[PDB]
Design a protein around this motif. Sequence first.
Motif, PDB file in Angstrom:
ATOM      1  N   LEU A 140       4.508   4.975   9.713  1.00  0.00           N
ATOM      2  CA  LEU A 140       4.243   6.351   9.328  1.00  0.00           C
ATOM      3  C   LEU A 140       4.950   6.668   8.015  1.00  0.00           C
ATOM      4  CD1 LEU A 140       4.607   9.612  11.388  1.00  0.00           C
ATOM      5  CD2 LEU A 140       6.424   8.990   9.783  1.00  0.00           C
ATOM      6  N   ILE A 141       4.380   7.615   7.265  1.00  0.00           N
ATOM      7  CA  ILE A 141       4.744   7.810   5.867  1.00  0.00           C
ATOM      8  C   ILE A 141       4.928   9.279   5.519  1.00  0.00           C
ATOM      9  CG2 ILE A 141       3.739   7.748   3.519  1.00  0.00           C
ATOM     10  CD1 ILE A 141       2.678   4.933   4.280  1.00  0.00           C
ATOM     11  N   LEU A 142       5.923   9.539   4.684  1.00  0.00           N
ATOM     12  CA  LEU A 142       6.069  10.837   4.036  1.00  0.00           C
ATOM     13  C   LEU A 142       5.047  10.943   2.903  1.00  0.00           C
ATOM     14  CD1 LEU A 142       9.030  12.946   3.206  1.00  0.00           C
ATOM     15  CD2 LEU A 142       7.807  12.005   1.229  1.00  0.00           C
ATOM     16  N   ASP A 143       4.267  12.020   2.902  1.00  0.00           N
ATOM     17  CA  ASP A 143       3.200  12.202   1.936  1.00  0.00           C
ATOM     18  C   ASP A 143       3.530  13.310   0.945  1.00  0.00           C
ATOM     19  OD1 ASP A 143       0.338  11.914   0.944  1.00  0.00           O
ATOM     20  OD2 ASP A 143       0.279  13.984   1.684  1.00  0.00           O
ATOM     21  N   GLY A 144       3.751  12.926  -0.313  1.00  0.00           N
ATOM     22  CA  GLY A 144       3.967  13.899  -1.368  1.00  0.00           C
ATOM     23  C   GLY A 144       5.305  14.610  -1.277  1.00  0.00           C
ATOM     24  N   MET A 145       5.461  15.667  -2.074  1.00  0.00           N
ATOM     25  CA  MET A 145       6.760  16.292  -2.323  1.00  0.00           C
ATOM     26  C   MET A 145       7.387  16.880  -1.065  1.00  0.00           C
ATOM     27  SD  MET A 145       6.982  15.604  -5.440  1.00  0.00           S
ATOM     28  CE  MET A 145       5.978  14.241  -4.882  1.00  0.00           C
ATOM     29  N   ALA A 186       0.823  -1.206   0.000  1.00  0.00           N
ATOM     30  CA  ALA A 186       0.000   0.000   0.000  1.00  0.00           C
ATOM     31  C   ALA A 186       0.860   1.261   0.000  1.00  0.00           C
ATOM     32  CB  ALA A 186      -0.932  -0.002   1.194  1.00  0.00           C
ATOM     33  N   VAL A 187       1.947   1.253   0.759  1.00  0.00           N
ATOM     34  CA  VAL A 187       2.842   2.408   0.788  1.00  0.00           C
ATOM     35  C   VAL A 187       3.527   2.558  -0.555  1.00  0.00           C
ATOM     36  CG1 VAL A 187       4.885   3.470   1.838  1.00  0.00           C
ATOM     37  CG2 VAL A 187       3.282   2.202   3.260  1.00  0.00           C
ATOM     38  N   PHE A 188       4.018   1.457  -1.113  1.00  0.00           N
ATOM     39  CA  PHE A 188       4.633   1.525  -2.420  1.00  0.00           C
ATOM     40  C   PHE A 188       3.571   1.942  -3.420  1.00  0.00           C
ATOM     41  CE2 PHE A 188       5.507  -0.548  -6.542  1.00  0.00           C
ATOM     42  CZ  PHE A 188       6.547   0.291  -6.909  1.00  0.00           C
ATOM     43  N   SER A 189       2.387   1.367  -3.265  1.00  0.00           N
ATOM     44  CA  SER A 189       1.257   1.683  -4.108  1.00  0.00           C
ATOM     45  C   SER A 189       0.960   3.159  -3.983  1.00  0.00           C
ATOM     46  CB  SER A 189       0.027   0.854  -3.714  1.00  0.00           C
ATOM     47  OG  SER A 189       0.229  -0.516  -3.980  1.00  0.00           O
ATOM     48  N   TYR A 190       0.937   3.613  -2.723  1.00  0.00           N
ATOM     49  CA  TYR A 190       0.674   4.998  -2.402  1.00  0.00           C
ATOM     50  C   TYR A 190       1.677   5.926  -3.098  1.00  0.00           C
ATOM     51  CZ  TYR A 190       0.302   9.287   0.234  1.00  0.00           C
ATOM     52  OH  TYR A 190       0.164  10.591   0.595  1.00  0.00           O
TER      53      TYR A 190
END
Lengths: 55, 55
Positions: free
Chosen positions: B50-55, A18-22
Amino acid sequence: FSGLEAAIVLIAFVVVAAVFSYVMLGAGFFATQKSQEVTYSGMKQATSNLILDGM
Amino acid sequence: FSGLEAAIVLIAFVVVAAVFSYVMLGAGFFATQKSQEVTYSGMKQATSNLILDGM
């Protein structure tokens, strides 16, 4: 051996997916949105031409 | 030889059984309740990502 632990991993396989997908989507939109910009600029490069008119 | 004394021992066999039974259950619940905690933490380990979102 229990599938209970398999679940624990199955999360991990899904989550990184999902993260890679994201990101790939985000990477992808930017890829596209970049691919669009060069095209718009590409036509604008040719059609923005200016000309000397007459004598 | 009288079973009267056999009774005296039969208590002892039963009692240590009940105590072992008593503790093994306690040992066992904790085993289980521990086995649960690692599982809850186990899923929480993967899903808490947790994830970095976008640029």
